[PDB]
Every structure is written in C-alpha cells, then in structure tokens.
Write an enzyme that holds these catalytic residues in place. Sequence first.
Site, PDB file in Angstrom:
ATOM      1  CG  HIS B 305      -2.090   1.010   1.046  1.00 21.23           C
ATOM      2  ND1 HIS B 305      -3.413   0.635   0.937  1.00 21.23           N
ATOM      3  CD2 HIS B 305      -2.079   2.364   0.980  1.00 21.23           C
ATOM      4  CE1 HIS B 305      -4.166   1.714   0.813  1.00 21.23           C
ATOM      5  NE2 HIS B 305      -3.381   2.776   0.835  1.00 21.23           N
ATOM      6  CG  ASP B 362      -8.235  -4.513   1.313  1.00 13.34           C
ATOM      7  OD1 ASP B 362      -9.078  -4.537   2.235  1.00 13.34           O
ATOM      8  OD2 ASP B 362      -7.882  -3.463   0.741  1.00 13.34           O
TER       9      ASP B 362
END
Lengths: 426, 426, 142
Positions: B305, B362
């Site tokens: 990320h 996620d």
Amino acid sequence: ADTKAKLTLNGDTAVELDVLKGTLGQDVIDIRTLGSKGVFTFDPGFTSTASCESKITFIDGDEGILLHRGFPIDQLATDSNYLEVCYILLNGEKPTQEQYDEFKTTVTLHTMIHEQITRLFHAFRRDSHPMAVMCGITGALAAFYHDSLDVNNPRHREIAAFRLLSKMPTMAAMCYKYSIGQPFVYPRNDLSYAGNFLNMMFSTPCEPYEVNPILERAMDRILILHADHEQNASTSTVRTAGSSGANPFACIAAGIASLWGPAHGGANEAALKMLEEISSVKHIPEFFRRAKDKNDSFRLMGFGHRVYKNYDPRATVMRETCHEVLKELGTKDDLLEVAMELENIALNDPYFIEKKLYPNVDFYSGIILKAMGIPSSMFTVIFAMARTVGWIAHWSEMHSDGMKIARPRQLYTGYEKRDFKSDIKR
Amino acid sequence: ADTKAKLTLNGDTAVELDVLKGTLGQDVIDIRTLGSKGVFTFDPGFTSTASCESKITFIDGDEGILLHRGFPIDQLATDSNYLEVCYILLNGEKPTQEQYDEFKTTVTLHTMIHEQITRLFHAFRRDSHPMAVMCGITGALAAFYHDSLDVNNPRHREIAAFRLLSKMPTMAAMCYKYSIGQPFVYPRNDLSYAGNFLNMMFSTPCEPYEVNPILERAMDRILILHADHEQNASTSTVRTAGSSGANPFACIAAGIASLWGPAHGGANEAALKMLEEISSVKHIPEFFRRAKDKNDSFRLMGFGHRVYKNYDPRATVMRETCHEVLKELGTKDDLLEVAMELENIALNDPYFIEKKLYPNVDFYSGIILKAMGIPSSMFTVIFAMARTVGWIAHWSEMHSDGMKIARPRQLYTGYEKRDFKSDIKR
Amino acid sequence: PIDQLATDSNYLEVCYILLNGEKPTQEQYDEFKTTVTLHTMIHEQITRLFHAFRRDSHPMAVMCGITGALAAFYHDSLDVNNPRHREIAAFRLLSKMPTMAAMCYKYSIGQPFVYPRNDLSYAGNFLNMMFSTPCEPYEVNP
Ligand SMILES: NC(=O)c1ccc[n+]([C@@H]2O[C@H](COP(=O)([O-])OP(=O)(O)OC[C@H]3O[C@@H](n4cnc5c(N)ncnc54)[C@H](O)[C@@H]3O)[C@@H](O)[C@H]2O)c1
Ligand SMILES: NC(=O)c1ccc[n+]([C@@H]2O[C@H](COP(=O)([O-])OP(=O)(O)OC[C@H]3O[C@@H](n4cnc5c(N)ncnc54)[C@H](O)[C@@H]3O)[C@@H](O)[C@H]2O)c1
Ligand SMILES: NC(=O)c1ccc[n+]([C@@H]2O[C@H](COP(=O)([O-])OP(=O)(O)OC[C@H]3O[C@@H](n4cnc5c(N)ncnc54)[C@H](O)[C@@H]3O)[C@@H](O)[C@H]2O)c1
C-alpha cells in the site's frame, strides 16, 4: 516575463522553486517536490492552486475571454456546429472534410442504446425529476458497457467517448418522454445532431414531426455554448474521479451530479418556483420575484457568474439567437416577452448593477428553451448533455498526463492519540 | 510552536505566509491568499496540497498510525463494533448507552428500501458485475429520495446519512442475490448490523439460517477496518463532488465507482484473474503467480500500500480474525494452503521484500471473504459499503466548514488566440 | 435433384414440393405463398416470453425454449389426427419460425424486434427482421 525565472520559499532557510510559463494567462509556481520534503501548502477550494496543465479551454474572466483550442467561443458558435466543435475539443485541431465525415458518421451510427437499458427507464417513478433519472441511467451504464471501462486503454477510451457523445441525447430525450408519459423516439440517422434531438424530444407516432431550421440551429448553438468551461467544479469532479481509474460513465454521471448540485437548495428551488409558475410583467419583474431574492438566488436563474467580471461571452450569440427564436416562433413566444423586462431590470436596477448580476448564457439559454416548449427540469439535462464532450476531453487529457491520482494532504486538528474505552453493551 | 507562526514566499515582493499548525502530523503554509496576489502554485495530484482541515482520521504512514477521532484502529477493531465506530466518526465521540441506543434504533428502522427502488435491480442483466449494479442503484437513489437532497439543510444531511448507512448493506446483499439468482432477503430487525448482512447475503426461504457468531464478528471487523481511510482518491472525489453541491446519494455513488477504479484498470483486472483461477496448492504457491509481475496490481491483490511504509496497521486484527474463521471452518479448508504460501512468499521473496509488498488488510479480508463463500466480485462492494460511513463524515465535515467549492487553477499551455474558418462544408 | 431446385427455385416453392409431392402451378403457389406471409406475426404474448430469458443466453437455446412453449398458446391445433389442425400447425411453423429466429438474434444483441413485412420475400423479410433498425430503412441486397 516578470519573475518567471525562479522563486524562494523560506521557513528558516531557502527553497528554490521553478515557475512554469503558460502560452496564455498566468504562469505558475512548481511545487511538486515540496511535500516530498514535508512542506505542504494549505488551500481548501484550490483557488490558489493549479491542479493541471491544459491546452483545451482558456478563460480570462476580467476580459470576458473564452477560447476552445485557441478559437473564441463566438467564432465557433456562429460559424461551426456542436459536432465540429466536439471534434476540435477532442482532437485539438479543426477537421478536414474527411476527418469530420468519419467522426460524424461514427457518432450517428451509435445513437441507439441497448434494448435492456431502456427497461431500466421503466423502473423509475413517473414523478421523478428528469435530471435525477438522467444521473441514474448514466451511473448505470458501466453494468452493460463492461467492455470499455479501462481508462488505460486508448481503444476503451475512444469507444467510451463515442458511446457518451452518441447516446447522451437519446438518454436525455427519453428522460423527457418518460416524465410526460409519451412514447420513446428512436434516433434517425438522416437527421443532424440537434435535429435528431429535437425530434426524439417532440416526435410522436401520431404524425411526422417538422424540424424548424431556426430552432435546430438555435439548439445546436446552446450545445456549442455549453460544450466546455475549463476547470470548474463539475469538470474537476470528472478529473478527480477519473484520476483513481474510475470508468468514463461513472465520471460523466458525477459531472452531471455536480452540474446539477447548486439547484438542490431550498431557497434555490423556491425562487425558481416563482420564476416558472409565474407569468406576467406585473407578476415576476414587478417587486414579487425581484423583492423575493434572498441568499444566492441568481446565477442559476441567469444572473451573474463567478468566472467573468462584466459579462458572459457565451451570452452574445445566445442573445442574438434568442432574438431569432422569439421572432420565428412569435405565435408561440410573444407571451414570454417578460424576458425584456427581466433583462431591463438586470441592467438598470441598482441591486443588479451593484452586485454585477448581468444576464449570463443561461438567462438567454433558458428563454429559448422555454419558448421551444421545453420544461425547466430539462434545461440542465441539455446543458450536461452538451458539457459531456468537455468532460471527455478533460478526462482524456488527464490520462495523457499520466493519470495523476488525487491524493491531497490535510491539516489535522482533531484529537491526538487517546485510548478507546466504552462501557456500553448493545 | 517554533516558527509555526509565519514564513515567506519570494517572487517579486517578499509576501509573508502564516504557517498553520496541526495537532498531529505536518504543518501547512496558508496560501489561500496568494490567488488574489496573482500568485498560484502547481501541484498535479495534490501531493503537497492540504485540500482541507480535518479532524476525522489521522495517518502517520511511516510509523503505521491510523486514528479515528484519535482512537487507535486496533482498539476499535477489537473493542468496538461497527455502529459505534460509525457514531464515533460522525459525532466525534464514543456514544453513551442512551446515544448508542437511539443511533442503533434509527439505523435498524430504515434498512428496508422503497419497493420501487427494488424493481431497478430487475432491469439490469443477471450477468452484470455486482459492483456495476451497486453503482447503478446508488446513483439512482436521488430520483427516489428527492426529499433529502438539500445539502445545506441540516435535517436533509441527517436523513441522507441514516438512509445511506441503513440501506447500503441491504442493497449490497441484493446485488449478490441478483447475481446468483436467489430471492432478495428482507432485513431482520432482531439481527445485528453484521449478522443482518450475512442473513441477507446467504439465507433462502427454503431453510432457517443461523448466523455463526464468529463469522458475525469477522464481518463486523471487516467493516470496522474499512470505515474510513483519510483523504484518499475516492474520498477526495466524494469531497470535491460535494463542495459543488452534488446530492449526498450521488457523492457516495461517485466514491463507490472511484473505489473499484483500479479493479477494471486493465493491468489489475488480468492480475486478479490469474490469482482467481488457480488454488490447487501447487501452481500459485510455486511461482505460477509470482513469475508473472510485469504490472504491479499489488495493493489490489492485498500486497502492499502506498500509504504505509513497513506494514498495514489495519491488517493486525484482520489476520488474527482470519485464522479464527479458517479454524471455525475446520475440515473444509484444504485447497486453501495457497494463502499461507502467498503470505510466505510476500514475507520471504527478495523481490517482495525489496518493494515492501506486505500483506495488507485486504489480503486477510479476502481470505475471510473467500472462506465464507463470498465471490471475489463482492469484495470491493463490501469495502465501499463499510467505507460509506467514512465518506458521509468527510462529506459532512466539508459542509460544516464553509462549503469551499473546488475551483482549481490550470497552467494553460495550449494554442494562443487563433481565428476560426470551417475547413469542412458539412 | 437438390442442385436443380437450389438454382431454379426458391425455399417456398421447394416447401410446396416437399409438403405436396408435386411442383405448384401459379394458382397453387400464389395461394400457399400468401397464406405463409399472412401469418408471419406471432401473438403479442409470446413476445413477452422473450423478455424472461437472460440476455447472455445462446440464441439456439432461446429458440428451443420459445418453440417448446408454443403449444401453450396454439392449443387449438394440437391434434395430430385432425388434418385441419395439422395444416394450420404446419403453416404456423413455416410462417413464424423466421420471425422467432430473428427475434432470438435481436434480443441477444440488444436491438429492438422487427415486425414481418408482407411486401418482402421469405428471405428478404428475414434479412430485414435480422438487420432492420428504426434508425433508417434497410436495403435488402438481391
Ligand atoms: N469503432 C468505434 O468507434 C466504435 C465506437 C462506439 C461503439 N463501437 C462498437 O459498436 C458496438 C457499440 O454499441 P453501442 O455501445 O453504441 O450500443 P449497444 O451495442 O449496446 O446497443 C445498440 C445496438 O444498436 C446498434 N446501433 C446503435 N445506433 C445505431 C444506428 N444509428 N443504426 C444502426 N444500428 C445502431 C449498435 O451497433 C448496437 O448493436 C460495439 O461492438 C462497440 O465496440 C465502435
Ligand atoms: N429521523 C431520521 O433519522 C430519519 C432517517 C431516515 C429516514 N427518515 C424519514 O423517515 C421516512 C423513512 O424513509 P425511508 O428512507 O426509510 O423510506 P423508503 O422510501 O426507503 O421506503 C421504505 C419504507 O420502509 C420503512 N422501513 C425501512 N426499513 C424498515 C425496517 N427495518 N423496519 C420497518 N420499516 C422499515 C420505512 O419507514 C419506509 O416507509 C422518510 O419520510 C424519511 O425522511 C428519517
Ligand atoms: N387457413 C389457414 O391456413 C390458417 C393457417 C394458419 C393460421 N390460420 C388461422 O389464423 C389464425 C392464426 O394466427 P397465428 O397462429 O398465425 O397467430 P396469432 O393469431 O396467435 O397471432 C398473430 C395475429 O396477427 C395476425 N397476423 C399474423 N401475421 C399477419 C400479417 N402478416 N398481417 C396481418 N395480420 C397478421 C394473425 O392473423 C393473428 O390474429 C387462427 O384463426 C388460425 O386458425 C389459418
């Protein structure tokens, strides 16, 4: 050049920044590597921040200048047509006969929407606002057109753009026909962009419709004059949404919603009420709607604009066209004459002179549409349908810029870290 | 506050600019006045521009800090429940039992959507991607809820907040049911927010559905962990569309679309397809997926990320939650040893170590979701669903501030004014 | 021989031969041809059945489904032991199959259904129902 060399940012020591020069308008201070050092600027609304470099539309507010790929809006509105203007906005140059004919033909060849998207129209309530229905239909397109969602694929982008330019008018007219209970009208390839629209708007199986040349030309001009307007709120919504990779249709739906936005106010709808439901020179332009002007109550109705100082360049031709339309329709217009009294007030009334509430493009655009027998709830639908090409151009341009993902900073003034402890049990 | 009072920009005249301080994070230079002086910055992407002043969420990317109203995410994901987090983000404080009771009650009694809205799903193709249908219904909400579209009206903001909060899971579960051909399930006033979601997702009229308390908490946790993530691209989109007056329903619809943007981003779509296919504990876990990495598409696969340097703070509680779910579904999880290997490859491959391709929240959410039998097509729908409370809070904070409309500048570099003369004759 | 018929005849005259055993005279052909064209349009309710199928379905499967659903409407020509029923049934199939086929096509691609036009030949009317669109008149190439 002024101080178009460099500049220094000093906190406790210097930081040299470059200044990029534009071909027109103001030059800017390059601050791209700043935050990459911790130093951030604070600018809610971005009125002091250039969000991108663009070659599409140039505007000089104090001069009342509007250009599209270098061409003044008045020149294009008078000597061109929406489709050729679309070609220019999208390609940067005017088309040759070969280029135009190709583009024109592709646009007309995709005017018909899938039979199933039409079923979606029937699920909405009859009493719903045409604009909301339009946004709903638009934000539903990606579910069908799943084959042109990749913003990083030129093939997808070009097909998507055509799908929007070809289909928007068809959608718009359908949001109209559904609202009034008349049957939907299929696009006819033998009719111009504007003529086919007027037809899909006013045709009926009861007899063939006759497209008046002056009305067709008037419509097409409303489209040109609404094709684009540089980095405004609505366009920025298309750029910001698309910067994350959002599909074209989703970005267009958001542009519509943003262009729709300022009309949701309770004081806005209440004033538009009197503008509509009232018809007489003693009724509106006579201390009734004029006296009942409270918070914003103006641009939406055609008075003033934040972009231009003294006048809206788009109003020049739009006012000329309003004359031609009012004159042609006559027996279907003379009653709307109060436009002269509203204009008389906006130019002479001290309240309007002082607050610079000059009639903008929408004042004259509105009078024409009303004269044509179009309801006010459809006006922004038509403006949005026109602005879509501008959204496509700005969106397409944003991608060539490397799709800069909108990842702004913030000034955090909330609580410092603290422990969570709740004794509830529900 | 050292020199957190002022500094200077030197173009042609030494203009002083107040340095504004925050309660946490970086300080910002107030440049909101530069515009009037004819001085503008240039920042495509806004990576050095504080788009606003916020108190909702704080992030220290390098130090893996994520605070919601000051409260650490770890304590909220473990101690609090989704609805309490909703209240916290929206009202800035943990609710009293009474305030919580009243909040939960309002949410529970507005979960069922207007039956006319329900008929919209039926106009979409049964084969539509549930996320495209989700964007379609949410953008269609404005046509029905025309009674709470006044963004400046305090009660409209409230009703629109509760409408979105209560109905998103209703609508999300309907999308899934529609995609598999199973009947829509009505909300259950006796069930919790998360348990009700599971019931609407999986039950049939054929037999009683009993919600697993472990999966109920796991889903509650997936939701809390996606509540809000500061000023990201999609929230920046929501805020921008909001400042331009767009109705709350359209703002959230724009955010949803902007969220799954990278999913249909060409290079990312194909990547998910390769991960999607194999799960035979011999290909993927043995450089089948690893060998092919010409496109990153990693954050989407749950690897890495842009926000955090070393790890994803949200992934702490999700991983722990992840193994519980798998144990709970004991002797069935055999073909799913690829999850532990993919994780191992992310922890031990020099390439993954180099690029810091750490398993993000996620990655684990995906495991929990896949373990529950939820198709990959519903993952982002579920995230956007939970993310809605964040978007609502952000949209609200933009309002209460001063509705500073998004009107950025543009470094124009296109054509200078040029005369126009139609090359074509059509 | 198939070659003779394919080159010097047409589907409808060949149909007349297959069904009757002999070639038709002008009077017989014109009668048969006219009855075939006069029943090309299918009941408005059978068209509603088309909309219940998924858009993604195979045109052939849709065709089989529509075909195996006809007896529910045409309940008046089911007796195989009644020549009257048999002749009406045969005409219903010969007249309507092309219309059904074209519709299985239009539905699959999302275009509107096209009504049969009595002024067009068996094949021309088919090509039309296949490729016509309300956007402009279609030109059937000879
Ligand atoms: N080369 C291009 O620029 C280009 C541009 C747009 C779409 N397309 C392609 O064409 C198809 C696009 O269909 P769509 O998205 O416009 O709608 P659609 O296919 O979903 O539904 C309408 C159908 O009617 C046809 N149609 C539309 N307007 C028509 C008209 N005026 N006359 C005759 N037929 C008409 C369309 O070709 C289509 O089959 C795809 O195969 C797409 O890739 C190509
Ligand atoms: N005070 C509030 O917080 C608040 C919040 C939301 C809506 N509302 C208002 O109350 C009405 C509710 O509108 P809506 O959006 O819920 O209606 P809707 O148009 O979505 O229709 C759903 C109907 O079902 C009812 N309903 C929904 N979920 C239910 C449940 N779980 N149990 C029982 N009944 C349920 C609703 O009251 C409504 O009549 C409106 O007039 C709205 O303005 C008030
Ligand atoms: N004498 C015969 O050979 C013969 C053959 C077939 C059907 N029929 C009779 O005609 C009716 C049959 O209807 P169907 O089964 O074909 O469909 P249908 O009656 O179920 O639906 C279509 C309707 O449209 C009419 N129609 C069909 N094509 C038409 C066209 N090209 N121009 C004008 N009208 C047209 C039909 O007569 C009918 O009323 C019955 O009464 C049946 O007994 C008679």
